[PDB]
Every structure is written in structure tokens, then in C-alpha cells.
Automatic annotation (TrEMBL), chain A:
GO terms for molecular function: DNA binding; protein heterodimerization activity; structural constituent of chromatin. The nucleosome is a histone octamer containing two molecules each of H2A, H2B, H3 and H4 assembled in one H3-H4 heterotetramer and two H2A-H2B heterodimers. The octamer wraps approximately 147 bp of DNA. It comes from the Eukaryota. It comes from Cyprinus carpio. One of its GO terms (cellular component) is nucleosome. It is found in: Chromosome; Nucleus. Core component of nucleosome. Nucleosomes wrap and compact DNA into chromatin, limiting DNA accessibility to the cellular machineries which require DNA as a template. Histones thereby play a central role in transcription regulation, DNA repair, DNA replication and chromosomal stability. DNA accessibility is regulated via a complex set of post-translational modifications of histones, also called histone code, and nucleosome remodeling. PROSITE patterns: HISTONE_H4 (PS00047). Belongs to the histone H4 family. This is Histone H4. Signal peptide: none annotated. Gene3D superfamilies: Histone, subunit A.
UniProtKB/TrEMBL annotation, chain B:
The lineage of its organism: Eukaryota, Metazoa, Ecdysozoa, Arthropoda, Hexapoda. It is found in: Chromosome; Nucleus. It comes from Callosobruchus maculatus (Southern cowpea weevil). Belongs to the histone H3 family. Residues 5-92 form the Core Histone H2A/H2B/H3 domain. GO terms for molecular function: DNA binding; protein heterodimerization activity; structural constituent of chromatin. GO terms for cellular component: nucleosome; nucleus; polytene chromosome. Transmembrane segments: none annotated. This is Histone H3. Keywords: Acetylation, Chromosome, DNA-binding, Methylation, Nucleosome core, Nucleus.
TrEMBL record, chain E:
It comes from Homo sapiens. The chain holds residues 1 to 74 of 93 of the full protein. Residues 1-74 form the Ubiquitin-like domain. This is Ubiquitin B. The keyword Zinc does not apply. GO terms for cellular component: mitochondrial outer membrane; nucleus. It comes from the Eukaryota.
TrEMBL record, chain I:
Residues 9-74 form the TATA box binding protein associated factor (TAF) histone-like fold domain. The lineage of its organism: Eukaryota, Metazoa, Chordata, Craniata, Vertebrata. It comes from Manacus vitellinus. GO terms for molecular function: DNA binding; protein heterodimerization activity; structural constituent of chromatin. This is Histone H4. Keywords: Chromosome, Citrullination, DNA-binding, Nucleosome core, Nucleus.
Length: 81, 95, 107, 23, 74, 91, 91, 106, 83, 97
DNA sequence: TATATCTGACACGTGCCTGGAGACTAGGGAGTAATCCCCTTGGCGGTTAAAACGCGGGGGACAGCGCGTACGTGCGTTTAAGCGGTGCTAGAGCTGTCTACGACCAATTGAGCGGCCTCGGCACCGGGATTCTCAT
DNA sequence: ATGAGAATCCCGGTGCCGAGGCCGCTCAATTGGTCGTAGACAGCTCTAGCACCGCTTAAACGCACGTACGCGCTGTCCCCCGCGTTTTAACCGCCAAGGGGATTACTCCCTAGTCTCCAGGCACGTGTCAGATATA
């Protein structure tokens, strides 16, 4: 249903992410690169979350399912259960 | 006057490392999550806390990358980070 | 007459709840007697240290209510706790204020 | 208090301050 | 008598200073411990800032206070 | 249902008798407690499976704590672990 | 006592009916099988506890494969496993 | 008539041993019926693909005994077995021959 | 036992060059050797402090290959070919 | 005579040691390091010979991984010689620091 | 900013109800003692591969310098995010129920393990004809 | 540019000790019965997720411009590489010695299990006090 939607990740949002990262000056080719990084990362997490829900026989992806996917990939996330 | 280039960037680092809020807009992030998950299983539903968990996880991941990329760019005697530096950072990281 | 066993060990974590979660966690067939006592004391100690450091951080930032930024600042500022929780993301955590020294233009 | 002979805290004193530092 | 200051790196500095000293002298004291001269050392003590001709006796000095290097080379 | 929140709050009043925590901080501390619980229990389980025993005891948990916790956290955690076990066995 | 050496050798003679295997390579295949068995088992155990159940069925390991194997390995292994399960229940 | 479960399901891995290891391994209180069949089929499949690639490597060096050098080559020259065995070191396995292209003459 | 001193110098320069040239390293500066000593020291320290605690929980006086394999599996560095 | 260019022998040794699979550290001094370090935890410990060989097989694989990461971080910043900066940044990006 | 008037999240009362605590009981996990033999530790010497050590030199690290261009900064403008209602459901969650699937026990028997030959794939030697390097 | 020259790959003999193929044999998988509860399934409530519409405003975006900074070039010096000589200790092999790991048998006490009892934490109301606000 949905079109190019990674462009909602905007250039000043990536700039804020780098400014929190500690980056003083950013080249202009990074905005196409970090969109691919987000695409890889969120596909790898959402694939596991969807398989967790499909095993649990539900339709809603829940916060604990996201936590279990992220814990399976080594990123434990505190504060959602 | 007009600020010298770099000073505003240092002030932005001072701001966005003091703050804790979500640096990506929530509705386009939601639509991105829904269209990524569109491909695996059609017609899912999402708890809003699950979409917020994805929000914070992906932002913290990208902050980790930008700190490592900043290290790689300082290692290369530069100040601008580059896609070279990103690719090296995550290749050493194991990705 | 009642005499709760966590009070027998002189603790504040629930020894009965820890013993139950040991017995139904499929960790082993049997579960020893002093095992939930030892583990409840260890858990209580780790919470004690992180809450003490977060209380110091909240008092230093002049706020009497520990928010999760104070936990982030408590954890990431000492070696042992940052080595323990080194792969742990904290919701509304934020980052330590680090700036590399090269990006500080002189004169 | 009770939890002052039971923890680890010796050195150094740690600063936890954050200042919006304008001009 | 023993006063601390955070750096822009994030690092605290340990130093002992007589509590009636000036502010240029303690910029020299921190210049002894860091690699930063006081041409760019802008200090803040609880909102109101610091000027080198002033002394610690007028600026609320105690045991173990805090200073903060900030920014803004004009 | 069921949390550690009451117990965390008791330890909080015992350490800093003036402060409080918001509910997000309580949720993070609760997730913290659950995580270290399952880490230590998962290490003591496989210690018992290595040594061909079938009872997780205080010795098993002591060696699992000494593996997991780095630095002086192990040296303190072992200490009050044995303190609590002795105080429990006396009563 | 007890290896998978016999069974790995049977699979080897099925695949390459001429080649042999050294003992130092057979031990590596043995450690391989123990590693992936423990991974899939400890993963399906976590699935069974996340869904509040008590049995581990073939539905569990069908998803525990999908979390652990990457790419086409999962699509082939799920097919191979369900072919074996259907042949088992049919006969 | 014996008719073991592995022969009953058409496999070459011990379904009985997989069941015994699942029971005496504290993974759950109960073990279903099709679960050891599924594990045995999966394990037999993965060792079939690894021995396939190892046999190809050991033939391409003109040998018959597969050694951990061929095991290392067969695993590292395939992306899926890399990602499956990323944190794995193999004893007497060696390294892939890879020179970074900058260091070449001249 | 008797003295048992300074075996970190038993890791000679040409050995470190061999390990470097498996990694495809064409040129090597001089300060690397003391760094490689310092890194290998702390890596062996971590694996031995895990394996010795494994043995003392097993109530033994010898350190086994399976204890080493368990200590290495613990740190995300699983090793095959020793059981 | 005859003399080679300084680096041709280096490429020769790289091809050689990547073709070969033997251990590269001498066994008795490594085997003596292990007891140097193990004195600091419990004295009078004994070692199975396969345990010593496992420690060799592990630590050499770790150091091969280190030098192949520092080689990348030294090709980055456009050099050829590894410097200790490369080792520090490799262990820093890896999360070992 | 004094005085007064409104607010929300937390701190603090109530009941309840269910999981924790207590007593007893037995049976199997585990401690402990003997024993026995594999394996580790510590010698010894010969040899020789490998480490160590100069030594020259050349190639790469590094510092300096100049150029231009890609990026920071700032201002108008324009586009969605966000808030705030509204409602309308699809599913999440809980409850009874009954069944059929897994645990368990007893008896058996073929599979797989320890052990023992054996021969050939492979390591090695000894040439011996090819193929990258380097001053021409 | 290329012939000398060091790698260097390869062909064929030789021996060897490891991979593999039988043989008891024993013990774990199998078969075939109860039994009892886990969960499959129907059913019901109800809640939170999803579409929606409109107002506001702030954050994105587009553009112009002026640099700081990346990047290339140049020289220069120093330090690491290839190589020949000494020297050293690793390695191979052998040979005692004992010590601690593995096993087995015996006892015992410690934890699962069942039952009963009851109070501690869950849930949900209420105050209360730091925070915002209108006028003077």
C-alpha cells in the first residue's frame, strides 16, 4: 500500500542523531547511507518480532515481542516489560 | 553578527547530548515500520508501545554508529564523517 | 507464627517469590534451600547500588525524583556497572555528554 | 545509614551536572 | 580547599586550591592539568560566570565545589 | 502483577530516605532485576549441567555470581550472599 | 561416549561415497552438532516459556529454526523437517 | 520387530537420542512427539550441506580425508554458514587466503 | 613455581610478525610488539580467571580442555574440536 | 649478490602463512605464560595438555582477528604500517574497551 | 510579585484473596571413603631451527603548502506533525470443557561402543623441469 | 626491455600409522499398556488500534553565499626490511614418580510433595502539595 517511506527519515533528523553522536561536521553522502542502515536494522528486528507473533498466534505485534527480538539480537532494552 | 561555522554545531552537540527526547518524527517513523512489516505478513496491527520500542532501539543504534564513525573519521585525520567511515565502523563492529 | 523467611535472612527481596521462580523456571530438577536466599541478597545489593548512585545523580541535578536519565548517568559513569550493563539500552536514556578534544577550535 | 558499610564507593567524587550555559 | 571542574570531554579534574585565590590563577592551575590554555577557558559557577580579576572569597567557595568549562570563542 | 516495585521502593527509602522514582524509572529497575535474575539462574543451571548434578545450591549461585559480576561487585555480592545465608540458617 | 561420529559418517557416505574424514575433523563435526542442538533447544525453551506453555512441539522448533538460521537455510530446513514429520506420522 | 523411530521417519540421526537429550536437558517439563523428529531432520540437513561443501573443497585440493582446513574453507566461503558460524573458531582450521588489494605490487 | 618470571617476553618479535602476516599485513611499526604483548596478556587473564573458577567449582586441581571450552563459550568465542 | 625489494618477501610470507595452518607461537613459552597467569588465581594448578593447546588455538585466532582489523583501520587513514593507534581503535570499535 | 484560586501525579487509607508459610514424610541425590591407574610433572641430553643481532638503504610516514569546492549558516515559505476529539470495530484476554497426547513402568532386544587388525592416503625425499624478480 | 636466479610446482618412490572394517555385548531405545492433565476450542467481554477531520504551528525545505577543510603535491629523513652471522633454547625422545581423577559402594539427610492456614501485596480509592494562573 505504502510508497517510498524511508524519506520520512529526514536530513535534519539524521543531523540530530549525529549531533547526539558527537559529530561536528557531516558530509552530504551520509543521508543516503544511514537510510540503508536503518532499512537493514529495522528489517532484521521486525522479522524476528513478526515470527514471534506468528508463533504466538496473534495479529498485534506487542512490546514484549519487540523486546524479545532485540534481546535475541543482543540489544537488551529496558522499560517495556 | 554571524556565527563562525562550527560554533553552532558545537552548541547543537551540547544541546542534543543534554536532551533525552526522540530525535525522529513519530508518524513517518510509524509509517516506515508499517511498510517494512508489510512485506513479511500482510495486515498486521501494532501496539503503540511496540512502535515506541522500535523507535528508541533504532535511535540508540544509530547513536552508537555515529560515535564509532566519529572515531574512525578522527582516526583518518579528518573532521567530516564519510560513508567510508560508516562502512569501516560497522565492518569492524561485525555487520 | 507467620515469620516470613526473607525477614529470617534479614532482607527486603521476596525469598519465596525467588524460590518459586527458580522452581518453575526449568533451571534444574531440584532447587537447594539456601539458593533463593543467596540470590535474593545479590539482587537486593545490585538494586541498592544503582539506586544509591541514581539518588546522588538526582540530588546533584537538584531534582528529588529519579528520572531514567539519572539511571543512565549512574550506570555509564562507573567501570563495573558499565562493564556489566554494557550492551543494555535504557528507554529515555540519553547519552553521556562526550565531546572529542580535536573538535574544539582554538583561538 | 545501613547501606554505607556494604557498598563500594571510594574514589573519586563524580560530577553529575548539566548546565544549559547561555550568553 | 579541593575544588573540581568538569571538562568538555566529560572528564572531572581534581585539584587543591587555597579558597582566597584569584580566577586567573586557577585557570593556570587547570592549564597545568589539561592541554588547554585560558584563551578559550570560559568558566561558569552556578549561573553567574567568572572574571579573572575576581577571587574565590567573593564567589561562594566551600569545600568541594564545582566549576564548568563551556564554549563560545566570540 | 507481578513486579519487584514494592521491594525496589523499600530499598530506595532505605538508601535515600527523601527521593522518589517515576514510573518509567521503576519499570527500568524492574526490567533490570528480571534480567540479572535470568542471567544468574541461567549460569547456575549450566554449572549444574556441567558438573552432572541436579540441585542448584548456594555454591552454584556463588560461582555463577563470581563469573558474571565484574570487579569488586563480585567481592561484595559474595560477601552479603554468605551473610544472608548464615543469618537464614541461624534462624 | 557419546559422539555423533557414526551418523555423521553415514551422511558423509551418502553425500560423497568416496571421501573420508579425519578424527580431528570428525570431532569438529561433533562439536558442531552439539552447538546447534543446544542453540535450537535453548531457543525453543524460551519460546515455550514466553507463550506460557509446558510442552515443546514441532511447531516450536519450526519457529526456532526460523530465528536461528539465515536466508535459504531456514527455507530448506523447515521443508526438510516437515517432510520428515509427515513421513513419520504417515508411517 | 524393532523398527526404530529414525528409520520410521526416514532419517539417519538418532531420534531416540535427541528425545533423551531434550528430556534430560531441562528445556521444558514436557517434550512433544514430532519435536525430536524435527530436530533430527534439521541437524541431518545442516551436516549434509557442510559435508557437501567440505567434500567439494577436499576434492579440489586432490585429497580424500576431509581435514579442518577443508572445514574452514567450506564454512568461510559461504555467506549463510558465515553468519551461522560467525563467533566460531575452528581448531587447526587456518585462515582464508585474502590479501587487501592496496598492498599488491606496486 | 620456582621463580616463573617474565614469560610475556617469550612471545618474540618474529612470532608476532607471523600472526600479523596471516592477517595480510605488509608493514609493521616497532611499537606494536609491546602492544600485542599487553593485549594478549589481558585476553589470557580473562579466559584463565573464568576457567580456574570453573575448576574450583568442580573441586579439582587440574584445568581441563572442557573448562577452557566453557570459558571461551562464555565470552562469545566458541571453539570447536575439543569436545 | 641478489636482493629483493623491501616488501616482496613480505607478500611471500603473507601468501605462505595464509596457506599454512600450524600454530605460530612457540609451545613451551606460551605453555609457561599460562602458568604465570594461573599462579595469580590458585597456586599448584595442573593443566591438561589439550587445555594448553585449546588456549593456543584460541588466542592465536583472536590475534589474527586483531591484526586483520588493524590492517583495515590502517588502510583507512591511507597508510601501510600498522601503528598502535590502529590496535587501540580496533579494540575500541569492537567494544573490547 | 502578593494573594488567592485551580490542578495532576504521587503518597496513603481500604478490602481481599491467593500465594506463601508450616508440619510431616519418604526416597533418592549426594557426601564420603577406598582404590587404582592414567596422566601430569620433572628430569636428562642432542640437535638444530629459530631467535637475536648488526647493517645498510630505500621507501613510506609526516609535515608543509596551496586550491577549490562541498558544506555550514541564515532567512523566507510551505508542508506535514501533532493535538484534540470521534467512533468503530477487530482482536486480546479470560473461562469452561473434555480429550487425546505425553509421562511412566515393565520387559526385551538390536544398535552402537570398546577393542583389535590392516593396508593405503598421505607425509616426505629427491630430484628436476618450470615461473616471479630484478638490474639490464 | 630480459637473462640470471631464486621460488616453485610437480613426478615418482617409500614407508607408515590412522581410517576403517569386523566382534562381542550390554544397555538404551522400543513396545505396549494405564492416567491424568495441557491445551484445543467454543464463547463472551471490552479495549485499544485504526481511520478521520480540522486547526495550529513548528520543523522541513529551498536557496544564496562565504568560507574551513578536504585533497593533492613535494620534499625529506628515519626506520623498518632483507640479509648474513652467532647463539640459544625448543623440541624430540626417554625415563621414573606419584597424585589426583575416575570409579564404586554405602549411608543420610534434604528437598519434593501434600495439606492447612492466613497475612502480604494487588487493586483501587482519597489527600496533598509542587506547579500554573488571574488581578493589582
Amino acid at each position: 500500500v505504502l510508497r517510498d517511506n524511508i524519506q520520512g527519515i529526514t536530513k535534519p533528523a539524521i543531523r540530530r542523531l549525529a549531533r547526539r553522536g558527537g559529530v561536528k561536521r557531516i558530509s552530504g553522502l551520509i543521508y543516503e547511507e544511514t537510510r540503508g542502515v536503518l532499512k537493514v536494522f529495522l528489517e532484521n528486528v521486525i522479522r524476528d518480532a513478526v515470527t514471534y507473533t506468528e508463533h504466538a498466534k496473534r495479529k498485534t505485534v506487542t512490546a514484549m515481542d519487540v523486546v524479545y527480538a532485540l534481546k535475541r539480537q543482543g540489544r537488551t532494552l529496558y522499560g517495556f516489560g | 553578527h554571524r556565527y563562525r561555522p562550527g560554533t553552532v554545531a558545537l552548541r547543537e552537540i551540547r544541546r542534543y547530548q543534554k536532551s533525552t527526547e526522540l530525535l525522529i518524527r513519530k508518524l513517518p517513523f510509524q509509517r516506515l515500520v508499517r511498510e517494512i512489516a508489510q512485506d513479511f505478513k500482510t495486515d498486521l496491527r501494532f501496539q503503540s508501545s511496540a512502535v515506541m520500542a522500535l523507535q528508541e532501539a533504532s535511535e540508540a543504534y544509530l547513536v552508537g554508529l555515529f560515535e564509532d564513525t566519529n572515531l574512525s573519521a578522527i582516526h583518518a585525520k579528518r573532521v567530516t564523517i564519510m560513508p567510508k567511515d560508516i562502512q569501516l565502523a560497522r565492518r569492524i563492529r561485525g555487520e | 507464627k507467620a515469620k516470613t523467611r526473607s525477614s529470617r535472612a534479614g532482607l527486603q527481596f521476596p525469598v519465596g517469590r525467588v524460590h518459586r521462580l527458580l522452581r518453575k523456571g526449568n533451571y534444574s530438577e531440584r532447587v537447594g534451600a539456601g539458593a533463593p536466599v543467596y540470590l535474593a541478597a545479590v539482587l537486593e545489593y545490585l538494586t541498592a547500588e544503582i539506586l544509591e548512585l541514581a539518588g546522588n545523580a538526582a540530588r546533584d541535578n537538584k531534582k528529588t525524583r529519579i528520572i531514567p536519565r539519572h539511571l543512565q548517568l549512574a550506570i555509564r559513569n562507573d567501570e563495573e556497572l558499565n562493564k556489566l550493563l554494557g550492551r543494555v539500552t535504557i528507554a529515555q536514556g540519553g547519552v553521556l555528554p562526550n565531546i572529542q578534544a580535536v573538535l574544539l577550535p582554538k583561538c | 545509614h545501613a547501606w554505607t558499610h556494604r557498598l563500594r564507593e571510594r574514589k573519586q567524587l563524580v560530577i553529575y551536572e548539566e548546565i544549559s550555559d547561555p550568553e | 580547599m579541593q575544588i573540581f571542574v568538569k571538562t568538555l570531554t566529560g572528564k572531572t579534574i581534581t585539584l587543591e586550591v587555597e579558597p582566597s585565590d584569584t580566577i586567573e590563577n586557577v585557570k593556570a592551575k587547570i592549564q597545568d592539568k589539561e592541554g588547554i590554555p585560558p584563551d578559550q577557558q570560559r568558566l561558569i559557577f552556578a549561573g553567574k560566570q567568572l572574571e579573572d580579576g575576581r577571587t574565590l572569597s567573593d564567589y561562594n567557595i566551600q569545600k568541594e565545589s564545582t566549576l564548568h568549562l563551556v564554549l563560545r570563542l566570540r | 502483577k507481578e513486579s519487584y516495585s514494592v521491594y525496589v521502593y523499600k530499598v530506595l527509602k532505605q538508601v535515600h530516605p527523601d527521593t522518589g522514582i517515576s514510573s518509567k524509572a521503576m519499570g527500568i529497575m524492574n526490567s533490570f532485576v528480571n534480567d540479572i535474575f535470568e542471567r544468574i539462574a541461567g549460569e547456575a543451571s549450566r554449572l549444574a549441567h556441567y558438573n552432572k548434578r541436579s540441585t542448584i545450591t548456594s555454591r552454584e549461585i556463588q560461582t555463577a555470581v563470581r563469573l558474571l559480576l565484574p570487579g569488586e561487585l563480585a567481592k561484595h555480592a559474595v560477601s552479603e550472599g554468605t551473610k544472608a545465608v548464615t543469618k537464614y540458617t541461624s534462624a
